CSV table of C-alpha atoms in Angstrom, one decimal:
chain,number,residue,atom,x,y,z
M,1,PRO,CA,10.6,-86.7,109.6
M,2,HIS,CA,14.3,-86.6,110.7
M,3,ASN,CA,13.5,-83.0,113.0
M,4,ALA,CA,14.3,-80.8,110.1
M,5,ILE,CA,13.3,-77.7,108.4
M,6,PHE,CA,11.7,-77.4,104.5
M,7,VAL,CA,11.9,-74.3,102.6
M,8,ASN,CA,10.2,-72.8,100.0
M,9,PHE,CA,11.5,-71.0,97.2
M,10,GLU,CA,8.7,-68.6,98.0
M,11,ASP,CA,8.9,-68.6,101.6
M,12,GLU,CA,9.5,-65.4,102.6
M,13,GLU,CA,12.4,-65.9,105.3
M,14,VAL,CA,15.4,-69.3,106.0
M,15,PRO,CA,15.2,-70.4,109.8
M,16,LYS,CA,18.0,-69.0,111.4
M,17,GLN,CA,18.5,-71.7,114.4
M,18,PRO,CA,17.4,-75.8,114.1
M,19,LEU,CA,14.9,-77.7,115.7
M,20,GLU,CA,15.2,-77.9,119.2
M,21,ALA,CA,14.5,-82.1,118.4
M,22,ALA,CA,17.7,-82.1,116.4
M,23,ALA,CA,19.5,-80.8,118.3
M,24,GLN,CA,18.4,-83.6,121.2
M,25,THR,CA,18.5,-86.1,118.6
M,26,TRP,CA,22.6,-85.3,118.5
M,27,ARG,CA,22.5,-84.8,121.6
M,28,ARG,CA,21.9,-88.4,122.4
M,29,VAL,CA,23.1,-89.9,119.0
M,30,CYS,CA,26.6,-88.2,119.4
M,31,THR,CA,28.2,-91.1,122.0
M,32,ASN,CA,31.9,-91.3,120.6
M,33,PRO,CA,34.5,-88.8,120.2
M,34,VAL,CA,34.7,-89.5,116.1
M,35,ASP,CA,30.6,-88.3,116.0
M,36,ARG,CA,32.3,-84.3,117.1
M,37,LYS,CA,35.5,-84.8,115.6
M,38,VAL,CA,32.9,-85.1,112.6
M,39,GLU,CA,30.6,-82.4,113.3
M,40,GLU,CA,33.2,-80.1,113.6
M,41,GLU,CA,34.6,-81.1,110.3
M,42,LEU,CA,30.5,-80.5,108.6
M,43,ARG,CA,30.5,-77.4,110.1
M,44,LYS,CA,33.8,-76.1,108.7
M,45,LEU,CA,33.4,-77.6,105.5
M,46,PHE,CA,30.0,-75.4,105.6
M,47,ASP,CA,31.2,-72.9,106.8
M,48,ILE,CA,34.1,-72.9,103.7
M,49,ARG,CA,30.7,-74.2,101.4
M,50,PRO,CA,27.3,-72.6,102.8
M,51,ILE,CA,25.4,-74.7,100.4
M,52,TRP,CA,25.6,-78.6,100.4
M,53,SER,CA,24.7,-81.7,98.5
M,54,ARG,CA,24.5,-84.9,99.9
M,55,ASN,CA,26.5,-87.3,97.9
M,56,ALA,CA,29.5,-84.7,97.8
M,57,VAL,CA,29.6,-84.8,101.7
M,58,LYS,CA,29.9,-87.6,101.7
M,59,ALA,CA,32.7,-87.7,99.0
M,60,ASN,CA,34.4,-85.4,101.1
M,61,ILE,CA,34.1,-87.3,104.9
M,62,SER,CA,33.2,-90.7,105.6
M,63,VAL,CA,30.3,-90.3,108.0
M,64,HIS,CA,28.2,-93.6,109.3
M,65,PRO,CA,24.9,-92.6,107.1
M,66,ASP,CA,22.5,-92.8,110.1
M,67,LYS,CA,24.9,-90.9,111.9
M,68,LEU,CA,24.9,-87.8,108.9
M,69,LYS,CA,20.8,-88.1,109.3
M,70,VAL,CA,21.2,-87.2,111.8
M,71,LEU,CA,24.0,-84.5,112.4
M,72,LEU,CA,22.5,-83.1,108.8
M,73,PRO,CA,19.4,-81.4,109.6
M,74,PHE,CA,21.2,-79.8,112.6
M,75,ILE,CA,24.0,-78.0,111.1
M,76,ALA,CA,22.0,-77.2,107.7
M,77,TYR,CA,18.2,-76.3,106.5
M,78,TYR,CA,17.1,-78.8,103.3
M,79,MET,CA,15.4,-76.6,100.4
M,80,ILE,CA,12.9,-77.8,98.3
M,81,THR,CA,11.7,-76.2,96.0
M,82,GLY,CA,13.7,-73.5,93.3
M,83,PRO,CA,17.1,-73.0,91.3
M,84,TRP,CA,18.5,-74.9,95.2
M,85,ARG,CA,16.6,-77.9,95.5
M,86,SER,CA,17.6,-81.1,97.7
M,87,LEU,CA,20.5,-78.8,98.4
M,88,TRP,CA,22.1,-78.5,102.2
M,89,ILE,CA,22.3,-74.7,102.6
M,90,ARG,CA,23.9,-74.0,106.0
M,91,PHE,CA,21.1,-71.8,109.1
M,92,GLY,CA,21.6,-68.1,108.2
M,93,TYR,CA,22.0,-68.3,104.5
M,94,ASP,CA,19.7,-67.2,102.6
M,95,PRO,CA,20.8,-67.5,98.3
M,96,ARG,CA,18.0,-65.5,97.1
M,97,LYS,CA,19.8,-62.7,98.3
M,98,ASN,CA,23.4,-63.3,98.0
M,99,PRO,CA,24.9,-63.9,93.6
M,100,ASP,CA,27.2,-65.7,94.3
M,101,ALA,CA,24.8,-68.5,95.5
M,102,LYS,CA,25.2,-68.5,92.1
M,103,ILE,CA,28.0,-70.9,91.4
M,104,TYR,CA,25.9,-73.5,93.9
M,105,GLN,CA,22.7,-73.5,91.9
M,106,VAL,CA,21.9,-76.9,91.3
M,107,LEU,CA,21.2,-79.4,87.8
M,108,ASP,CA,18.9,-82.0,86.7
M,109,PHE,CA,21.0,-84.2,84.3
M,110,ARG,CA,19.7,-86.9,83.0
M,111,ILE,CA,21.1,-89.6,80.5
M,112,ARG,CA,19.4,-90.0,76.5
M,113,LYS,CA,35.1,-96.8,105.2
M,114,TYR,CA,32.4,-94.2,104.1
M,115,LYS,CA,33.8,-91.7,101.4
M,116,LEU,CA,32.7,-91.7,98.0
M,117,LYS,CA,34.5,-90.7,94.8
M,118,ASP,CA,35.2,-88.0,92.9
M,119,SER,CA,32.6,-88.3,90.1
M,120,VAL,CA,29.6,-89.0,91.6
M,121,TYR,CA,29.2,-85.2,92.1
M,122,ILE,CA,32.3,-83.6,89.9
M,123,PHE,CA,32.2,-83.3,85.8
M,124,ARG,CA,35.6,-83.1,83.7
M,125,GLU,CA,36.6,-83.7,79.9
M,126,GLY,CA,36.9,-87.4,79.8
M,127,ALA,CA,35.1,-89.0,82.4
M,128,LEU,CA,31.4,-89.9,82.8
M,129,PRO,CA,28.5,-89.7,85.2
M,130,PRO,CA,28.2,-92.8,87.5
M,131,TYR,CA,24.7,-92.6,87.4
M,132,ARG,CA,21.4,-92.4,84.3
M,133,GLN,CA,20.4,-89.5,86.6
M,134,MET,CA,22.1,-87.1,88.4
M,135,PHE,CA,22.1,-84.1,90.0
M,136,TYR,CA,25.3,-81.7,89.8
M,137,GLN,CA,26.5,-78.1,90.8
M,138,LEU,CA,27.7,-75.5,89.4
M,139,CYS,CA,31.2,-75.2,90.9
M,140,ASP,CA,31.3,-78.7,90.3
M,141,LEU,CA,31.3,-78.5,86.6
M,142,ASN,CA,35.1,-78.6,86.3
M,143,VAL,CA,34.9,-77.7,83.0
M,144,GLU,CA,35.9,-74.0,81.3
M,145,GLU,CA,33.5,-73.9,78.2
M,146,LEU,CA,30.8,-74.6,81.5
M,147,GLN,CA,32.5,-72.1,83.5
M,148,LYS,CA,32.5,-69.1,80.5
M,149,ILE,CA,28.6,-70.5,80.4
M,150,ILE,CA,28.0,-70.3,84.4
M,151,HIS,CA,30.1,-67.1,84.6
M,152,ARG,CA,28.7,-64.7,81.5
M,153,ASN,CA,26.4,-62.9,84.2
M,154,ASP,CA,28.5,-62.8,86.2
M,155,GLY,CA,28.3,-58.4,87.9
M,156,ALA,CA,25.2,-58.3,87.1
M,157,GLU,CA,22.9,-61.1,87.8
M,158,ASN,CA,19.2,-59.3,87.9
M,159,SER,CA,17.1,-60.7,89.6
M,160,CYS,CA,16.7,-64.1,91.0
M,161,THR,CA,13.5,-66.1,89.9
M,162,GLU,CA,13.3,-70.4,89.6
M,163,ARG,CA,13.9,-71.4,87.2
M,164,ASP,CA,16.9,-69.8,86.3
M,165,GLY,CA,18.1,-68.2,89.9
M,166,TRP,CA,20.7,-65.5,88.7
M,167,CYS,CA,21.8,-67.3,85.8
M,168,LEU,CA,20.9,-66.0,82.8
M,169,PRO,CA,17.8,-67.6,81.2
M,170,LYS,CA,17.5,-71.1,79.3
M,171,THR,CA,21.0,-71.6,80.9
M,172,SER,CA,20.1,-74.8,82.3
M,173,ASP,CA,19.7,-76.2,78.6
M,174,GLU,CA,23.1,-74.7,77.3
M,175,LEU,CA,25.2,-76.6,79.3
M,176,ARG,CA,23.1,-80.3,79.7
M,177,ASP,CA,23.5,-80.3,75.4
M,178,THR,CA,27.5,-79.1,75.6
M,179,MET,CA,28.2,-81.6,78.6
M,180,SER,CA,25.8,-84.1,76.1
M,181,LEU,CA,28.1,-83.5,73.5
M,182,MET,CA,31.2,-83.6,75.6
M,183,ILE,CA,29.7,-87.3,77.0
M,184,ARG,CA,29.3,-88.5,72.8
M,185,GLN,CA,32.7,-87.5,72.6
M,186,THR,CA,34.3,-88.8,75.1
M,187,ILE,CA,32.8,-91.9,73.8
M,188,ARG,CA,34.0,-91.9,71.0
M,189,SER,CA,37.2,-91.4,72.2
């Protein structure tokens, strides 16, 4: 598609290098020095945080979308199934072999110049998700209770499953109910 590798949760190995088509496409698109600058910036940010969401990345650098859709498959690979679905992972990083990746797992919450804001990917007591269906990452839930629910099983993550990953079972529903309660609390205030 965009010269990206799509990894399933049941795939044995994860890619350790991009595709040569993606490398040549980036070589073609990289025209101004600002492109090299933003490439280095994205590389450093994926070095600090190995797993990223597109909206979270857009909230950290101001890049042109047509440049980002080419740069991302060159730096990271895309997850299709599993606890880290719809997330970009640095080449050579396997979340199914790192318990710390628990803090990078995804959570789908449905209600019932180029840089973006913080509310597009960060949850806080007193704010309101800007969209009807969001894909948060467990590290960006800046609440003490949600983080306690997340780290309840720290140091003894047992096995990595598809429904919950390194987290304890039925954790996602617990976080979802807590965020709904906090949303109603913020609405009342």
